[PDB]
């Protein structure tokens, strides 16, 4: 990791044992559940591509998903190469060179160049660029490892609205979808896939009713 | 979070693994229980909107409450905009741009922006403004996910007074009701819904008796 | 709390995740057991009233004890308020005000006021004042939830004197009773409530024996 | 280990209890599963050769595997002495001695030579050379201690492709096979050792298919 | 406790949670066992009298000993007052008041006074003095609470010399005897009080043999 | 212990809780195992004799070993005094006193003296010296509490070769014998003490076969 102290004093730190353990245990316990993404992202704030590779490589099992993640990363490295030409210019001997895809993915750069890119002026955020590429592949993994389709999420006849809504927003959370489309699934599907009895109730509230009002309206139906 | 050092030197740091796990296990273990709000608020001291959002996004499950909270937050951000019109013409180069409700909520603002208002003299403490909106949305949730009103809490045949007075001020603690109404519930219901045996003993003290007189009188029944 | 660093800089620090966990486990493992009150005093070393209410409020359940505690704090506050003369008109900017009972209890004051009082020499130690009120209320509660009278503790037919002494000064520690009454209990009851055999041993030493002499005599019975 | 602090400041410190313990417990619990080698690299960031011997000598249990690794360490050591002969006379003015194989392996050399080599400019990275020699012998242990070869990974009749693919990308992970060769093993063996139903669907995709296209095709199978 | 930084700055810091918690755990796991007195002393590095009292009060149960310990501390406090009485007239303007036993016992002395004595020119280490007084009483607990004497350990017909010697030196640790008396007990009781089969062997090695030599001798009897 | 900071500022530090807990746990799990001995050095890197006395004295039980160790140290101590006699006539004015053997074992030397010798230039390493005596004595203990002869380690009629090479080198590790003789045990005894079926397997490879070759050859017999 690299920890910035007062005055922007940037110092690399080797990775902590209790980070290593927390992150590995999270993936053993909860698998590819959506909270893994914010947890991953948090626990790798200021990480180098080597520290990020550590976190993935210290995981055993789930090797079908990690093989997909490698490929996804290899695709984002071919796309960084496509977008940023490979030509070495009249750059100074002591100044940082220009990162490649494989520099970003942590394979052709050294730790000192990765610390260098991050700390240097101008900086290149090779650690966070790589995080976006991992997180994308994780979006593919979460989406792939979902057991449920969001359209089949429906209120039962004897199902409290509130337990259905937990089901609706779990299965929705685990979709990759535009926000606009997710807005549409809330405003169309929630009232639409309800039970007749509760369906009536949410309609009487009209279109400016809140989920709070909606849960409290269906408290005893 | 942002650690205030000596000479008033404020340096940001990312949120700890053991804060993340203590907050995560709290929600798993204790659900929407009243002490969860001071516990959340306490583990979130010195938090930015990004750190508060981290803590909420690392909560896996309970998504009907997180959606109810999203709508609540949006209502407090939008309400902030209601109070404050858009600031016309050019922004001054010595001055920070004044936050909109969506900058406070952490979404049309960067992390660096959040740190910018909060640290820049005279500080705008957007973390502690937004935090109060979160603690607002949580109270609504704590109060909703409560199964019992005070009328529904009574002492059974052989139940010790002590466990009942605990049940009573736990359910009162979690109610929506005002202090004049929560006084009325205390002075009426508490002795009224005691069992025959304990009710007889509390009647023999008089009505002017204290909770201390009430606890040491009715203990062995 | 407020951590004093070098050359007497007292600077506030948030209550640590492990402070919180420690108080949660202490209350979990040992409830309303005597030595828990020292754990609290220790965990509240250099604490503010916000940090005292945070610790009390972070307690799961036990609202009969906490409602009793509120009643005691509110009584201690009304008594402080009673004794201190009322301020004539507003407080001029150079006048650091003198706290009312509710200022001490953290309900009418700001954190900056609580810090202000403590650091502005001759210090008004509002944390340490409020802690005595809380500790005082914890002793009443503790004494009141204490199961067994000191009078009723007695030796088994061939029970070891040492184990009987452990029970006697364990129960004695939870007794309301005066130091002078407890000195009588030492001189009268300790031999008195022993069993026929050990009683005889103990009687033969006369009253000049210390507890080591009582212990070494009853080393074999 | 040796901690690089602000501005090339290298400072010696002891190997951490909870480091040491983390390594003993990974080996106690999990032996020589593929994830153990990345864990060992994760836990030894900035370790000297001495610190690296500390970690091998603190293993109890499994001394045939540890023996295999010493022999490997002597092989890797002898090869370093073959490639670079002894350097005659007394050491060059203000220059560090070129280490032997036994110096990299931490036996003929002293900890102060090891700290000089690592911290000097140009640095001699003795810690990372020996660490490769250890990682090579841990791979011989991993591979030997494995019961299944990648030729032997095959799908059940009613088995999910995904769980099988997890056994395959785990087994592929422990292969000493080169990357051009691992690529043949992916495009050939995965479908070939598939069940007849999932095999048919995957053959229909053509030879252009990704792992994702293969997993989403055999989702219903 | 009081933490010394560079330039001889001694600044008090509040008692650590995990120090507190570890102490508590020691008394529960090992009771008042011999090895506890060096662990306690170890855990009470830089302790004030108030931190020493905090450790004693943070224990519950085992109160016959806690009573022995109280009385012993009072005796020693009474001894310091006898050895060091009050000197004529009021206190110096710039210096501290000379300590009483009750000030060393931390009961009549404020924390500030206690900081005062350790930091003062000339300093009285009232912590380290009080701790020795505590340790005298702890040794009285160890010696009283040992179940058996060094005289009472002799070797059975199927007992291994090794286990016999384990028992001998265990029991010795807890006795009152001096090193020249303890020396006599090694050279006299151990072989004397051994079983016939090991005794012939040990006599044969002759009285200049070590315990390692005696232990190897008696290894297959 | 003594922590060497940047630019070589050596300041003594209090004996860390997880130093104390780590050594306690280590002894509880691994007793007289050979692995205790590197762990002992690693956990004592940077120690004083006071601190080494703390770890040894905080060991409960094992009092046969503590007497054997004690004896080994007094022997090493007696000898250090024989070889290093104190200088003729009057003392150098500024200098520190001569460490005697008991000083080095921390018996007769205070904390300050031990800190002087270690930090003084040229340093007298009382800590590292005491550790070799402690390690010498620990190696005797380990070896004593090991019982099996290496001649007695043989393969069962259908025992896995690995479980026998593990037993063989576990017992070999605790043998006293020179390295060339341990090389002789490797070449003679290993293949010799194997069962008819595995013996046959190894005999077919020819006698030049490496342990990697012996282990893959007997992978399944």
From TrEMBL, chains A, B, C, D, E, F:
Residues folding into a coiled coil are none
Has the keyword Repeat been applied to this entry?
A: yes
Cell location: Host cell membrane; Host endosome, Host multivesicular body; Virion membrane; Virion
Q: Name one GO cellular component term.
A: host cell nucleus
Query: Which residues are listed for ATP binding in this entry?
Result: 18
Please state the span of the N-terminal signal peptide per the UniProt entry: none
Q: Could you tell me which cysteines form disulfide bridges? A: 198-218
Q: How does it sit in the membrane?
A: Lipid-anchor
Keywords, ordered alphabetically: ATP-binding, Capsid protein, Host cell membrane, Host cytoplasm, Host endosome, Host membrane, Host nucleus, Host-virus interaction, Lipoprotein, Membrane, Metal-binding, Myristate, Nucleotide-binding, Phosphoprotein, Repeat, RNA-binding, Viral nucleoprotein, Viral release from host cell, Virion, Zinc, Zinc-finger
> In terms of domain of life, where is this protein from?
Viruses
GO biological process terms on file: viral translational frameshifting
Q: What is its main location?
A: host cell
Q: What is this protein called?
A: Gag polyprotein
- Naturally occurring in which organism (per UniProt): Human immunodeficiency virus type 1 (HIV-1)
Phylogenetic lineage:
Viruses, Riboviria, Pararnavirae, Artverviricota, Revtraviricetes
Gene assigned in the entry: gag
Q: Which residues of the full protein are shown?
A: 133 to 353 of 403
